Amino acid sequence: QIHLVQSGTEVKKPGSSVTVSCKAYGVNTFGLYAVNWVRQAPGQSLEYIGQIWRWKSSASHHFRGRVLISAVDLTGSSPPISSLEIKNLTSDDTAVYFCTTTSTYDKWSGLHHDGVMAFSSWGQGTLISVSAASTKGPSVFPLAPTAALGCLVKDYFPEPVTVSWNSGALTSGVHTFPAVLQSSGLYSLSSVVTVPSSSLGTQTYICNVNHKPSNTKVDKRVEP
C-alpha cells in the first residue's frame, strides 16, 4: 500500500531557496514509478510543476530554470525519496506543494500517455509560505454582547492559533472563522458564540487562545 510522506511546513523569506522532500513508502523503485510534482495556491486550482520519469527529470515552461527535481532509490532505513528544489522564492510561490506517483510499468494502462499522465497517489502536501514576517504572538480582544459574543485574535504570525471556550466545556453554537491575511502580512481571526440573552449575567464566558509558535497562551473573560 502506497503512502507518500512529505516534509513539513516551511516559512521562507523572499529570494531564498527551499527543498521539499517526499518519502515513497510502498514504492519499489523510481525505475517503475514516475514522480510528478503539483502545487495549489490558496483558494486556487492545481498546477503542474515538473516530473522525474525513467530517471529523467524536467519542468514545465512556467518553472524551467528555477526548479530542480531529483529522485533516489533507497532501502532499509528509508524508502525511495524524491525532492523538489525551488530557487528565488517570491510571494506567488506560496502554496501547497504535492508530490505524486503513478506506476509506468504497464504501457497499456491508460494512466499515462508518453510522459503526460494522471496522478494515482498523492502526498498530504507541504505548505510553503513565503513572507518577511517574523514570529509574533496575538493580541486578544473581547467582542461583547439570543445574543452573540466572541473574541478577536489579532496580528499574529505564523499560523495556527487554536481557540476553545470555557476550557472546552462550551462547544454548541461556536463558530471559529478561518484566519485572514491582512495588508500588514500578519494574520487575524475571530471566534464567536451565540447564547440565550437570559444567561448573560448568570453565565461566565472565556475564550482560551493558544499560539504555540510564540509560546503564547491567553484566557480572556468576555463580559457584557
Binding site: S45, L46, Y48, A118, S120, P142, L143, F177
Partner: protein, 214 residues
C-alpha cells in the same frame, strides 16, 4: 497548452441525488486522456476516474465518466455524505497536463436568513491604538451574501475583509464575518457605523448600526 473550462462552479444537491459536472477542452482529445479527482477541505485530492471512463481500484461505482465531442462529464449517482466537496477535471493528452478551475458540490437546504450582529471596537483595542468593527452573519443559507460598510453614511472601500466558515455538518448553514479596520484617529472622528446585508432570505436589505459611545 490545452484549456479545460469546468461547469458549473458550484451546485447544491441532496443525499441520493444524481449529479453531473462537466468540462470542455479547448481542443479535441481523441485518446480520452482525461481524469477526475475529488478534494475534501483540508486534504489531498484523490483520483477517481482516468482515461475518461475507467474507475480506479477502490472507487465506488456510483461514479462514472462520459464524453461527447470536446465535453467530458463526471456523473455521481446516489449522492452520499462523503461525496460532498470539490471536484477537478484534468487533461493529460498533451504536455503539460492541465486542470479545470473546479466544481464545489454542497448540501441543499431550505432558505434561512442570517441573524445579524455588529460589534464596536473594545476599549482595550482602542487603548492599544487600533479600531476594528466586526459584523457577524450567523447560520444562513444559501451562501451568497453581500455586506457593505458605511461610516457617516460613506461607502467603505478597501479597508475590509471577510471570512466564511465551511458548510456546517449538522444544519448545513454558513456563517460569515466581516471586519472593518481603521486607525484609532478616524474611528474617534465619525459618529455612526453601519453594516448593510443583502441576502435571499431577507425581504429587504438589513442594516445593523451603532453611534460611537452609546
Amino acid at each position: 497548452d490545452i484549456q479545460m473550462t469546468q461547469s458549473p462552479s458550484t451546485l447544491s444537491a441532496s443525499i441520493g441525488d444524481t449529479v453531473r459536472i462537466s468540462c470542455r477542452a479547448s481542443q479535441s482529445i481523441t485518446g480520452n486522456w482525461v481524469a477526475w479527482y475529488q478534494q475534501r477541505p483540508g486534504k489531498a485530492p484523490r483520483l477517481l476516474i482516468y482515461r475518461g471512463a475507467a474507475l480506479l481500484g477502490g472507487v465506488p461505482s456510483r461514479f462514472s465518466g462520459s464524453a461527447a465531442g470536446t465535453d467530458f462529464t463526471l456523473t455521481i449517482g446516489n449522492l452520499q455524505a462523503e461525496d460532498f466537496g470539490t471536484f477537478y477535471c484534468q487533461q493529460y493528452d498533451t504536455y503539460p497536463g492541465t486542470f479545470g478551475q473546479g466544481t464545489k458540490v454542497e448540501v441543499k437546504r431550505t432558505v434561512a436568513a442570517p441573524s445579524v450582529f455588529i460589534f464596536p471596537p473594545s476599549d482595550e483595542q482602542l487603548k492599544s491604538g487600533t479600531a476594528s468593527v466586526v459584523c457577524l452573519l450567523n447560520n444562513f443559507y444559501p451562501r451568497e451574501a453581500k455586506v457593505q460598510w458605511k461610516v457617516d453614511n460613506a461607502l467603505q472601500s478597501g479597508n475590509s475583509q471577510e471570512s466564511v466558515t465551511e458548510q456546517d455538518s449538522k444544519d448545513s448553514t454558513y456563517s460569515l464575518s466581516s471586519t472593518l479596520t481603521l486607525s484609532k484617529a478616524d474611528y474617534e472622528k465619525h459618529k455612526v457605523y453601519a453594516c448593510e446585508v443583502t441576502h435571499q432570505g431577507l425581504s429587504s436589505p438589513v442594516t445593523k448600526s451603532f453611534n460611537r459611545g452609546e
